[PDB]
Design a protein around this ligand. Structure first.
Ligand SMILES: CCNc1c(C)c(=O)n(C)c2ccc(Nc3ccnc(Cl)c3C#N)cc12
Ligand SMILES: CCNc1c(C)c(=O)n(C)c2ccc(Nc3ccnc(Cl)c3C#N)cc12
Ligand SMILES: [Cl-]
Ligand SMILES: [Cl-]
Lengths: 125, 5, 125, 5
């Protein structure tokens, strides 16, 4: 209906609680493996944030996997930074990690992150 | 909070 | 880190995608039964929005149930309105549904919704 | 969108 009222902080409060569930390992249903590192997460949050995970978990066979192995070129710290961004809206972008974050965001199909990485790199040229 | 969206 | 940048629309965009997954019945993992009506949802979104579902799905036995039956006094339309609010931040509050929405929000432990229902009722007294 | 939170 068009007569709805809206609670401004709702989406942010939901994301905060999803991050609290992730921190406590509650109802996490997939482990993402990035070389030697493992990251537990919720498939729905991954799909909601990434074109790659949206494609993976809508596949009729991959939707049922409990472990997903990423390409060995993917940097675990870059993945960790992006996983934290998925669950908090905050991206820890630094001179020392920007190339890895951008490469990981291109692989994960997270265009908005790729765009801000490109802008930050271009400003330092 | 609440607003008219 | 304290040097993060933030994408303002991220939380809202995540919630929009969770609602699209719900509409398409993708990765839904529980059916909530409210008298004769059934509602498919994601357990993590329910927990992130409701004190009752947070308690239910953190219980070591109930976390594994695929069906949850609500109290027979709960109005299905009231539940539907609140489930839509969980997934969109929009509450379809109307003169004809406010008492049922408020009763359902009290049962679901959604205080912010209870508070706005009380304010709207008080304004019409 | 991006901002300093
Ligand atoms: C199909 C477009 N790829 C994406 C790109 C290219 C992208 O940059 N981002 C950030 C994205 C985020 C979420 C999603 N996920 C969804 C997009 C559309 N619809 C649904 Cl249900 C989901 C989910 N879950 C996709 C992308
Ligand atoms: C414990 C406080 N009850 C709640 C009340 C009374 C309430 O009014 N609301 C809206 C709520 C929303 C989410 C949640 N869910 C969480 C609250 C705190 N921590 C986590 Cl991990 C979750 C999740 N998932 C609880 C409540
Ligand atoms: Cl597997
Ligand atoms: Cl069951």
């Amino acid at each position: 209906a068009d007569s709805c009222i809206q609670f401004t902080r709702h989406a942010s409060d939901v994301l905060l609680n999803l991050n609290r569930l992730r921190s406590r390992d509650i109802l996490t249903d997939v482990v993402i493996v990035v070389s030697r590192e493992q990251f537990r997460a919720h498939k729905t949050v991954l799909m909601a944030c990434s074109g790659l995970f949206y494609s993976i978990f809508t596949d009729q066979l991959k939707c049922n996997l409990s472990v997903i192995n990423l390409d060995p070129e993917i940097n675990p710290e870059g993945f960790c930074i992006l996983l934290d961004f998925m669950y908090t809206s905050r991206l820890n972008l630094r001179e020392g990690n920007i190339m890895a974050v951008m490469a990981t965001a291109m692989y994960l199909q997270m265009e908005h992150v790729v765009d801000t990485c490109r802008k930050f790199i271009k400003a330092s040229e | 909070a609440w607003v008219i969206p």
